[PDB]
């Protein structure tokens, strides 16, 4: 066919991210007037306080206890939009390694509590 | 848990394992054989992505800090399609002190399972997704006449030169010598002002004296050419002073058989390890059975790029050169016999099926006295493209899958060259250890222009724009020199190799040079078995009347797909059991005109 | 004429679009560097006659079409960006995918 | 060594600087002199910035970075100590005046190691993460160090708003770069930094002279920047709320009044080294233009 | 563009055989600098076209004649070399008294 | 060619007025350095030509009008020197207010 | 007449090479199957094996004293070429100077025998 100078072939099948990591479904509301956006490696636990978080059974969790310890469970480096007034519902997932959070916000900086 | 196409994955961080993608415009594919990070926490720089504070950069850590074997880089290439003689694959590239550290998993291993390099606070990212890095190319036949060579050794992906010579004079010009003290100071002191890896060769003739000296000078090697007279003594007194100084000897052997043919210079070798310059013989050597050295085991042979793409052109091209760099008046009879009988289709195009068994190991140039020095790497796949096109995939390659002949022709400009030189220990491939000497590319322009040129962890030449411009894409886009080329950062990123004994004699302190010197090592333990994927030693013979190439029937197995019965009714029999290697010139190559202007 | 550094280097553009525009009057395909030589002319020019900004990324999707380039040139070229002084000062000029069609 | 009058005292009354033997002499009669511009927002990606900036009349760069790589390509940071060394040692080869920006992220120790190794300010951008901590600690080991701290505040407002940005910084001298907020910073309302006493707020020259092509320019410069694809709502969102005509406008009226101090120009990720002169001098011509003399001028 | 440095250096000749060019119009007769780059300029655009080297050698000998150049200027010219990239890749063309008859 | 470096950085002024000379056959009202580098390339072809230095700074003032180049340019543009290679030599000229009428 | 420039102006007479070296006519055959060409200043005596030397009268010389300690009577730089099977006449002298030869093929490395 054509020739195209540094084609792709690619192979045969989807491809698993995030494979042996089961998430949870949570819902986060906007509740500011701007808009915010956060990433997959944000430490949800610290993000704006104009978002609200409401956990797999749809209630209000108004100190994040489902939000502690987890990132989003999107492709790395992804991130997801929340305009103001917005709700979506949100896949996430623990975070790994040693399961220590330091910077961010300072809301940890140190072991996540086991 | 979720799952994600394999276009969509590509767009993110490039093609991942079972995918393939295309050498340029070439024929060649080559496949990812393996991924070394983990679907879900691939390392990724900008806003808002994975590489910041606390998520996928470590916050604790400072850059002389290590948890477990992993420490901080200077710098880390996130998601490099990795291409070398160890294999193709996709992984993260760590760099730290100048040298490759880590090749593997980037991130923090706070959040991170399986990290095997960190992303520090002292840590650049370079973007590599989407993008093929290999080594810099080494071109170890150079002749030293301007300095302008150096900018475009590295726009053709060239990071090391063997080289030799003392500037415009005839000497150089024939010549890869810097003869003496004097030329090989002068040879490291103006290589202290450029940016490229550097080694010199002295003059292998006369007695041992005159021959051990310019070692102690600080050559890297010897290089004995027919022109300073490349006679019997020549090569055994020249071999004899480097294996008691652990150099490297390259040779133009006598084209003229003055004092004797090709089995005469081969017995004074006496079995001691010798670099072949250009062993086909266009432009110098043993007339015309100097290909024969591709079947002895203590002989590294090379070629040079201007015959390697058998072309159309390169028999018309070739005959005129001769007459102008010899002044062969067509006129007398000895001249034009003289080049008539040099200038052989026959081995021209047999040199480039050897190439494809391995039988030559080394890619080089011949810079300005022959060959092109800005093309070693072009022309090397460029006879890649052919060798698929005209007998098919190599043995062990599939349809979207040229791996195997992709690292057999890779290896004749990064590592053969460096096991040859004996500076594999620095440089040569990308391995944790080696210099961090990058060359990336994008893959519709590999082989023809890279993208960057890294030098030792700092980028030296480069694509770049318009400086005033409020990107840095912006027209007019050239290659440019970079921050590598400056200051102190020029005598930083870059190194001069020389001899253990010219090292040791404080030649750095005497001849005021600011660039640190590497000795070169394991010089004579190498021989053709050392060569990666170029180890093949095939019972070559050219025919003294017909010039014709030959191999015997066991020669032509395990070279191609086609296996050697099928090949047998092809190439030509002669009057013996052997098989003439022959194939039509090129008309139309790759890395070619869709490229470059002019 | 007081030429600063950035006007200097710019006259390169000039001369490969020369070369390039001479190479396709005589019926040549352009390759890579032509190609992008002549849609960066093309958009140096119309932004020194005072065209806007959008008109000109717009316009040089029409310099070159698919059959006047080498196989392959017009997936290629990608994007194309130079910036050049308006009559309102320097500003940046974007195409993207200037051959098609 | 002095300003005022030039000659020998010998024949002339009221000389403060003698022209001697070993004195050479510039005629400037008919000319103008200014010091040499400052440029504190340049993006350290290729050398020949510097004879370009020359031209624009700039003889001083505060920079950041480690030539063309994407973490160079996007913020000014010269990430530690190798980084810092090797922006030096290019640096001692070329004819400008230099200093360099290290990372402004991570703990103490990592961020004053990288001060240990030479930088004279630390640069906290987004792309590295433009959070409380970041801020506080980074704050804090300038105040510890007697350094500058330049500021690319959080965009997508991820960690929270401006008014946490201010907060965090607790009343502590900052650099706020670009605070018209066009390539990066607290959409929409980074421009209120200018309210504030210890925030000495900077513009970048792309957008200073607010022009015809100015927007569509912007907008498409977001578009190839980040990737944007103008078929996914969110991309366009972020855009279209991105470039603002309004703050844009009222920029350069801000300008006018004081209300932003300094200018810079972005080299090489957002704006041109060579113009941040130029462009200045745009901005006076046009307010002119609009508003009449300056309090005080006159014909 | 992405020019190598190779390529930007022979847009030297491209501009010095258009100021040949141009004199040669005006009815001048060329000087040393004027014939090489003229002929130079005709063996790059040939070999562009598609000629072969062996073609190149001997058409460029048409270029200029022995009365359209300054006295002693074709016994000056004894050789010119250029490299181009042809169709095959790039090739060396010698041209050998070029300026003759 | 045997190039020196002086011929090298002539070739700036042949691509400048060309620039300038297209630009002016669009209908383009001339800057500064567009009107700077047309005379110059004038002067210097007229010196190539034979021209005697008296007779270029005289004709160099007759290359464009007050009417072809921007406002205020002709103000600009005081004087302009450029040394040729005449029949005899290496010779300066110099056009004082070439911008009149 | 025509101006050329760098022309050259010859004089009188022609020029005599090795002026007071006598010179001995002998004959070279090469018997091997490919050409050989031994350039002026080569040690005739240390030539390929494949060479025949052949004395001034015409006798065959097996131990090539006739090629001891001489050169080729040829202008400095040029060669004479042999083609397999083919005889030619040449002349030769003797050496000058400390008459020493060091290296070539190692069969002298030191003083001629007087
Ligand atoms: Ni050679
Ligand atoms: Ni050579
Ligand atoms: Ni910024
Ligand atoms: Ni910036």
Redesign the interface.
């Known amino acids: 066919g ?22 949870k479904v949570i819902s986060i509301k906007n509740t ?1 007037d ?10 949800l636990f ?5 978002l609200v978080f409401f956990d797999e059974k749809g209630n209000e969790d108004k100190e994040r206890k489902v939000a502690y310890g987890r ?1 989003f ?7 997801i ?1 929340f ?1 103001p007034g917005d709700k979506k519902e949100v ?1 996430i ?1 623990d ?12 809301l940890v ?1 140190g072991k996540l509590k086991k | 848990m979720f799952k994600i196409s394999r276009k969509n994955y590509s767009d993110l961080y490039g093609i991942t394992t079972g995918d393939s993608v295309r050498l340029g415009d070439t024929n060649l594919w080559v496949k990812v054989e393996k991924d070394l990070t983990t679907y879900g926490e691939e390392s990724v720089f900008g806003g808002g992505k994975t590489l910041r504070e606390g998520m996928g950069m470590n916050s604790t850590m400072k850059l002389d800090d290590k948890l477990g074997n992993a420490e901080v880089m200077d710098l880390v290439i996130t998601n490099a399609l990795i291409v070398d003689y160890t294999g193709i694959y996709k992984a993260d590239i760590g760099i730290k002190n100048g040298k490759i550290a880590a090749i593997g998993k980037s991130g923090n291993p706070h959040l991170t399972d399986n990290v095997d390099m960190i992303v520090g606070i002292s840590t650049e990212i370079s973007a590599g997704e989407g993008k093929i890095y290999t080594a810099g190319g080494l071109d170890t036949h150079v002749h030293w006449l301007e300095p302008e060579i150096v900018p475009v050794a590295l726009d053709g992906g060239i990071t090391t030169v063997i080289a030799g010579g003392t500037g415009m004079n005839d000497g150089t010009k024939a010549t890869t010598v810097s003869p003496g003290k004097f030329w090989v100071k002068s040879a490291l002191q103006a290589a202290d002002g450029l940016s490229i890896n550097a080694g010199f060769l002295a003059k292998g003739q006369g007695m041992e004296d005159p021959i051990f000296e310019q070692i102690a000078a600080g050559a890297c090697g010897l290089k004995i050419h027919e022109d300073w007279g490349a006679t019997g003594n020549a090569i055994d007194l020249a071999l004899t002073v480097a294996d008691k100084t652990d150099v490297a000897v390259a040779i133009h052997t006598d084209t003229l058989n003055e004092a004797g043919f090709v089995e005469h210079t081969i017995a004074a070798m006496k079995g001691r390890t010798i670099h072949a310059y250009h062993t086909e013989g266009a432009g110098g050597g043993h007339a015309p059975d100097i290909l024969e050295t591709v079947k002895y085991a203590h002989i590294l042979p090379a070629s040079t790029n201007p015959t390697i793409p058998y072309t159309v052109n390169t028999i018309a091209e070739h005959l005129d050169m001769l007459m102008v760099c010899h002044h062969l008046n067509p006129k007398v009879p000895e001249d034009v016999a003289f080049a008539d009988s040099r200038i052989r289709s026959q081995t021209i195009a047999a040199e480039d099926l050897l190439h494809d068994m391995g039988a030559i190991s080394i890619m080089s140039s011949d810079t300005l006295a022959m060959g092109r020095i800005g093309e070693v790497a072009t022309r090397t796949w460029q006879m890649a493209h052919k060798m698929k096109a005209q007998f098919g995939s190599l043995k062990g390659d599939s349809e979207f899958s040229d791996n195997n002949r992709v690292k057999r022709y890779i290896s004749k400009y990064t590592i053969n060259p460096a096991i040859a030189h004996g500076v594999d220990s620095y440089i040569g491939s990308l391995e944790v250890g080696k210099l961090a000497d990058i060359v990336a590319w994008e893959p519709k322009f590999f082989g023809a222009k890279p993208y960057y040129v890294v030098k030792m962890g700092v980028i030296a030449r480069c694509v770049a724009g318009d400086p005033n411009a409020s990107i840095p894409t912006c027209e007019p886009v050239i290659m440019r020199d970079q921050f590598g080329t400056y200051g102190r950062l020029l005598t930083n990123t870059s190194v001069s190799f020389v001899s253990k004994i010219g090292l040791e004699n404080g030649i750095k302190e005497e001849y005021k040079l600011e660039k640190e010197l590497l000795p070169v090592k394991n010089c004579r333990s190498v021989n053709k078995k050392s060569m990666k994927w170029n180890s093949a030693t095939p019972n070559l013979e050219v025919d003294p009347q017909t010039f014709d190439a030959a191999v015997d029937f066991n020669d032509l197995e395990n070279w191609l797909e086609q296996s050697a019965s099928e090949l047998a009714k092809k190439l030509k029999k002669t009057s013996s059991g052997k098989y003439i290697l022959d194939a039509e010139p090129l008309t139309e190559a790759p890395l070619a005109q869709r490229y470059f202007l002019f | 004429m007081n030429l600063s550094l950035r006007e200097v280097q710019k006259l390169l553009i000039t001369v490969a679009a020369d070369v390039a525009r001479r190479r396709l009057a005589r019926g040549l395909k352009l390759n890579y560097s032509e190609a992008v030589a002549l849609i960066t002319d093309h958009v140096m020019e119309g932004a020194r006659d005072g065209k806007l900004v959008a008109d000109l990324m717009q316009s040089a999707r029409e310099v070159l079409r698919v059959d006047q380039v080498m196989e392959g040139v017009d997936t290629m070229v990608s994007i194309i960006q130079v910036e050049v002084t308006f009559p309102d000062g320097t500003k940046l000029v974007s195409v993207h995918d200037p051959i098609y069609k």
Chains 1, 7 share one sequence.
Do not use: C, Y
């Open positions: 054509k020739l195209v100078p540094g084609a792709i072939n690619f192979a045969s099948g989807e491809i698993v991210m995030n494979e042996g990591r089961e998430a500011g701007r808009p915010i956006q956060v990433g997959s490696h944000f430490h610290e993000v704006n306080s104009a990132r469970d999107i492709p790395s480096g992804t991130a939009r305009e896949s997932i975070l790994a390694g040693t399961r220590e959070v330091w910077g961010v916000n300072g900086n």
